[PDB]
Structure formats: structure tokens, C-alpha cells
């Protein structure tokens, strides 16, 4: 599987890696995308960060 990071390129594999490809932005205010990879599992927001994952591939 492929999604698409934010930082030192566009997209990344996490065949072995992981499975899915989640998000992280913050709602403290500024709504903001802060972190975006691949997991096996979505944790979940809180208070200050939400988390959408995927498992479609390119959907992230």
C-alpha cells in the first residue's frame, strides 16, 4: 500500500511496514495537519489532535 506523506516527498510504501495510512492535524484552534503516515492501528484524538486513517489506498 501507498499514501501520501508532508514532508521529504508525495507518497510512501507500508506494505510490511503496516497496513493503514492515517492523519494527525490539531483542533486546539487553527485546525492543522500535523502528521500523516502509515499504522496498524488508529490510536484516537483527544483533546487537541484527531487521526483519519485509510485502507484503500490513495485515499490518504
Avoid at 12 to 17: F, I, L, Q, V
Avoid at 33 to 54: A, E, F, Q, T
Wanted: one cysteine or more; charged letters at 20%.
Amino acid at each position: 500500500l501507498k499514501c501520501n506523506k508532508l514532508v521529504p516527498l508525495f507518497y510512501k510504501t507500508c506494505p510490511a511496514g503496516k497496513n493503514l495510512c492515517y492523519k494527525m492535524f490539531m483542533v486546539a484552534t487553527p485546525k492543522v495537519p500535523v502528521k500523516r503516515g502509515c499504522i496498524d492501528v488508529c490510536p484516537k484524538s483527544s483533546l487537541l489532535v484527531k487521526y483519519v486513517c485509510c485502507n484503500t489506498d490513495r485515499c490518504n
